[PDB]
Design a protein around this nucleic acid. Structure first.
Ligand SMILES: Nc1ncnc2c1ncn2[C@H]1C[C@H](O)[C@@H](COP(=O)(O)NP(=O)(O)OP(=O)(O)O)O1
Ligand SMILES: [Mn+2]
Ligand SMILES: [Mn+2]
Length: 425
DNA sequence: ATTGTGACGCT
DNA sequence: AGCGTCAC
């Protein structure tokens, strides 16, 4: 009753760019704007692999991981932008820099946790407190929430329904209680409208957002009304939302763990999890996972918004599928040097921008016929940003996998170099 | 012949 | 440290 914490202490937002790589290319090339278009990597094998898809193209069924020739079968007028190639591999620099633009804007409002190249979590608790004290008791107008949906409303034209649900929400707000969680979420949604307006004005990129009490609910909310809209998921809306929500839709339950939850417990939806005790869930899935599941099916999650805007690792990877697998010493050396050269460029830029230096170099390889995505992962010291030294060290670390008696056997299907363990510089 | 990343957990 | 899981 009174002593049961409800997970309503924080206001957390998740902001995620709409078809991000496509928007980057459309800003650069106006001919692609408001068109079915996609961003692809490489071009020889089946027109290239698709990695981003505009919503106009999604209406025809084009998806990520689709080959471009098959997408053209679905959408003959599909326009394509190619990822930059450098040193024989895809180079994502343009998208990382656009990401930095977005992150730097978001950092002006509150402390963000970079969750991916195109999304970040925001802890807005202090911001909502300050804004509530500054309001001094005046109500919140629907004009301050022009693109916000309230999940589970209305109850009892899409824009008409959105406005109806918003009016229902706002008419029920207790604006004199500065401690009301629903009011806090609402003021958070106002701040998030402002953040998304600033992002669009200063970059041209549109984004969606979720506003709730934790990271999981914020991300789930963000996905509900994409694109170019934001969604507030309140504590009280959790029972209904979760009553038909497949378990796999919740962050971290999309893989084998969610499948085991479904199979062992004989359930399909998130809300059904409430029928089990914490001890039962711990017995089936471990203490940490069990506590997490017991709280999460009730809308409660405590994972903090970490103050980390920069990545922790800088990596360079290339696959060599099929008959292109590396089978000679010279091939492995040359590709290790290409990877190390891109890595050195990015590492020097990172040192100059962020006042830090990586100290450990991770080398990973996949070998042909091996079932696992990574066949070997070994680390060595990273003492200077030199591509020749880094590639030589990677070769020294991996050379005992060659079972040949000039040749390389069995052939390598993936190379991977990663700089980690940063220290202030 | 989804590719190229990046974070975090387990032992 | 090296391997595995998960998303993005
Ligand atoms: N599997 C993958 N492989 C390579 N690049 C990928 C990728 N998945 C995503 N990217 C790249 C391309 C993506 O543009 C970008 C952000 O990933 P999302 O947010 O998951 N997808 P998007 O922003 O496109 O659309 P929306 O959020 O509106 O549904 O990262
Ligand atoms: Mn996105
Ligand atoms: Mn994303």
């Amino acid at each position: 009753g009174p002593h049961m914490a409800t997970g309503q202490d924080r206001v957390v937002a998740l902001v995620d760019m709409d078809c991000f790589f496509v928007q980057v290319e459309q800003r650069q090339n106006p001919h692609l704007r408001n068109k079915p278009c996609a961003v692809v990597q490489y071009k020889s094998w089946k027109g290239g692999g698709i990695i981003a898809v505009s919503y106009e193209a999604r209406a025809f069924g084009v998806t990520r991981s689709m080959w471009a020739d098959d997408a053209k079968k679905l959408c003959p007028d599909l326009l394509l932008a190619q990822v930059r190639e450098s040193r024989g591999k895809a180079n994502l620099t343009k998208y990382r820099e656009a990401s930095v633009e977005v992150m730097e804007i978001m950092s002006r409002f509150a402390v963000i946790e970079r969750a991916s190249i195109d999304e970040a979590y925001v802890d807005l608790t202090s911001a909502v407190q300050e804004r509530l004290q500054k309001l001094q008791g005046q109500p919140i107008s629907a004009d301050l929430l022009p693109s916000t949906y309230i999940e589970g409303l209305p109850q009892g034209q899409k824009e008409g329904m959105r406005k109806q649900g918003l009016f229902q929400w706002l008419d029920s707000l207790q604006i004199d209680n500065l401690t009301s969680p629903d009011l806090q979420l609402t003021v958070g949604a106002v701040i998030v409208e402002e953040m998304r307006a600033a992002i669009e004005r200063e970059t041209g990129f549109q984004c969606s957002a979720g506003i709730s009490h934790n990271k999981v609910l914020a991300k789930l909310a963000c996905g509900l009304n994409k694109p170019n809209r934001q969604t507030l998921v309140s504590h009280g809306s959790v029972p209904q939302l979760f009553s038909q929500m497949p378990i796999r839709k919740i962050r971290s339950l999309g893989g084998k763990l969610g499948a085991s939850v479904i199979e062992i417990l004989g359930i399909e939806y998130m809300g059904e999890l409430t029928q089990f005790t914490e001890s039962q869930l711990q017995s089936h899935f471990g203490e940490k996972n069990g506590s997490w599941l017991y709280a999460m099916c009730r809308g409660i999650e405590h994972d903090p918004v970490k103050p980390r805007q920069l990545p922790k690792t800088i990596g360079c990877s290339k696959n060599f599928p099929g008959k292109t697998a590396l089978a000679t010493r010279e091939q492995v050396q040359w590709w290790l040097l290409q990877l190390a050269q891109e890595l050195e460029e990015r590492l020097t830029k990172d040192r100059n921008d962020n006042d830090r230096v990586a100290t450990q170099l991770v080398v990973s390889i996949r070998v042909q016929g091996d079932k696992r995505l990574s066949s070997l992962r070994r680390c060595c010291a990273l003492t200077r940003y030199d591509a020749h030294k880094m590639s030589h060290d990677a070769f020294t670390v991996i050379k005992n996998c060659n079972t040949s008696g000039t040749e390389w056997s069995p052939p390598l299907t993936m190379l991977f170099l990663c700089a980690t363990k940063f220290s202030a510089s």
